[PDB]
C-alpha cells in the first residue's frame, strides 16, 4: 500500500484523457474541491469576485456552443448545482442546452436548486419556473406541469378552472375557458402576467390539438406571428421561440387538413 502520489495521479489523468465520463467526474470533483478550499484562504470580496467571474464564464460557455456535448453541459450544470453562488445561471441558456443535449434531468435539478436556495435571495423566479415547466413538458411529466401552472404560474381563478377541466379530459370546456381568459379585458384585481398568457395560448393549442380541431389549431398557431390578417408563414423561421412553440402545431394542422 506504500504507493506514491504519482502512481495514483498519472493513471487518473491518463484515463481522463480517453474517457469523457471520467474526465467529467474528475473535473467536477477538482472544481468543487478547489472552490471549497478557497473559503479558508481568501476574503469575502475576493470569493464574490471569483464566483461572479465563474458565473460569467459558465454563461459564456452555455451561450456560445453548437455541438452541445452531453458530458460538458452536464458537468457545467452539475458544478453549478453544488455551489449556491453559481445557481444564478441564465435559465434560458440552461434549458436550451438541456433540450439540445437531452439532459433535461440535470437542468431540472439546477432549476429546482435555484428555486430552493435563492428563494430568500419578469421576475427571475417566474422565468426559472417557466423554464422548469418547459423542461418537464419535454419529458412528458404533465402532472408536475399542471401542478407548477396551478401553484406558481397561474394567479387567476379562470386558470384554475380551465386546468381542472383539462385534468378530466374535458378539453372543450378548457379551451372555452382559455379563450375567455385570452379575450378578457375587464380584470378587476389586475392584469395577468406575460407567462400566464403564454401558458394560456399553449394550453389552448394543446386543447385544440386533442379535440382534433384542425382549423382552430392552424388559426391559433399563426394568429400571433405576424401583424397582417393573412399571416406570413415564413415569420416562423424568425424566432427560435416560434420555431419551438408554433411550428409543430401548425405543420400538424396543415397536414391533417391536406
Partner 1 sequence: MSSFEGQMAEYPTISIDRFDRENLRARAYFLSHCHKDHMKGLRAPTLKRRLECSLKVYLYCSPVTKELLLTSPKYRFWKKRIISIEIETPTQISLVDEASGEKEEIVVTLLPAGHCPGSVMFLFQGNNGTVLYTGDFRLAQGEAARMELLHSGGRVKDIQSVYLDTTFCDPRFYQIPSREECLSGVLELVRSWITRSPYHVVWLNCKAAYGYEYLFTNLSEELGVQVHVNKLDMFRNMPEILHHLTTDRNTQIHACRHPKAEEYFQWSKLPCGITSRNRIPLHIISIKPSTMWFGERSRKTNVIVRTGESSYRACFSFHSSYSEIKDFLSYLCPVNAYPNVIPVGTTMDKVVEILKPLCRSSQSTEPKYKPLGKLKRARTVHRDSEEEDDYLFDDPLPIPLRHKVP
Partner 2 sequence: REMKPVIFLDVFLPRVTELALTASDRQTKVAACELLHSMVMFMLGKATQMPEGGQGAPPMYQLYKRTFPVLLRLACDVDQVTRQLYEPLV
Nearest CB to partner 1, comparing residues 67 and 183: 183
Q: Which does 30 bind (CB under 5 to 8 A by kind): partner 2, partner 1, none?
A: partner 2
* 234 makes contact with partner 1 (CB under 8 A): no
User: Contact region for partner 1 (CB under 8 A) — 13-21, 58-66, 161-169, 211-219?
Assistant: 211-219
Q: Which does 196 bind (CB under 5 to 8 A by kind): partner 1, partner 2, none?
A: none
Length of the chain: 258
Do 139 and 106 contact (CB within 8 A), yes or no? Answer: no
Q: Which does 18 bind (CB under 5 to 8 A by kind): partner 2, partner 1, none?
A: partner 2
Residues in the chain preceding a C-to-N separation beyond 2.5 angstroms (breaks): 121
Do 80 and 58 contact (CB within 8 A), yes or no? Answer: yes
Taking residue 230's Cβ as centre, other Cβ atoms within 10 Å add up to 7
Nearest CB to partner 1, comparing residues 127 and 211: 211
> At what angle are helices 5-16 and 20-37 packed, to 10 degrees?
130
Positions in the binding site for partner 2 (CB under 8 A): 1, 3, 7-8, 11-12, 14-15, 18-19, 21-22, 25-26, 29-30, 32-34, 36-38, 41
Residue 179, SS3?
helix
Q: Which does 63 bind (CB under 5 to 8 A by kind): partner 2, partner 1, none?
A: none
Q: How far apart are CA 151 and CA 153, in angstroms?
A: 6
Taking residue 239's Cβ as centre, other Cβ atoms within 10 Å add up to 12
Which residues sit at the interface with partner 1, rule CB under 8 A? 172, 175-176, 179, 182-183, 197, 201, 204, 208, 211, 213, 216, 219-220, 223-227, 258
Amino acid at each position: 500500500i506504500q504507493i506514491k502520489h504519482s502512481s495514483l495521479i498519472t493513471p487518473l489523468q491518463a484515463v481522463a484523457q480517453r474517457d469523457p465520463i471520467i474526465a467529467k467526474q474528475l473535473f467536477s470533483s477538482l472544481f468543487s474541491g478547489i472552490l471549497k478550499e478557497m473559503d479558508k484562504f481568501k476574503t469575502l470580496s475576493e470569493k464574490n469576485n471569483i464566483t461572479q467571474k465563474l458565473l460569467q464564464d459558465f454563461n459564456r460557455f452555455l451561450n456560445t456552443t453548437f455541438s452541445f456535448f452531453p458530458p460538458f453541459v452536464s458537468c457545467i450544470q452539475d458544478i453549478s448545482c453544488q455551489h449556491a453562488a453559481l445557481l444564478s445561471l441564465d435559465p434560458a441558456a440552461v434549458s436550451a442546452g438541456c433540450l439540445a443535449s437531452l439532459q433535461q434531468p440535470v437542468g431540472i435539478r439546477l432549476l429546482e436548486e435555484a428555486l430552493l436556495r435563492l428563494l430568500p435571495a419578469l421576475p427571475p423566479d417566474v422565468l426559472r419556473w417557466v423554464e422548469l415547466a418547459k423542461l418537464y413538458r419535454s419529458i412528458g411529466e404533465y402532472d408536475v406541469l399542471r401542478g407548477i401552472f396551478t401553484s406558481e404560474i397561474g394567479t387567476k381563478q379562470i386558470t384554475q378552472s380551465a386546468l381542472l377541466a383539462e385534468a378530466r379530459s374535458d378539453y372543450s370546456e378548457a379551451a372555452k375557458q382559455y379563450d375567455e381568459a385570452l379575450n378578457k379585458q375587464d380584470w378587476v384585481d389586475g392584469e395577468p402576467t406575460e407567462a400566464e398568457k403564454d401558458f394560456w395560448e399553449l394550453a389552448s393549442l394543446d386543447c385544440y390539438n386533442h379535440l382534433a380541431e384542425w382549423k382552430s389549431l392552424e388559426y391559433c398557431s399563426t394568429a400571433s406571428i405576424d401583424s397582417e390578417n393573412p399571416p406570413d408563414l415564413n415569420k416562423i423561421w424568425s424566432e427560435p421561440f416560434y420555431q419551438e412553440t408554433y411550428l409543430p402545431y401548425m405543420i400538424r394542422s396543415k397536414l391533417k387538413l391536406l
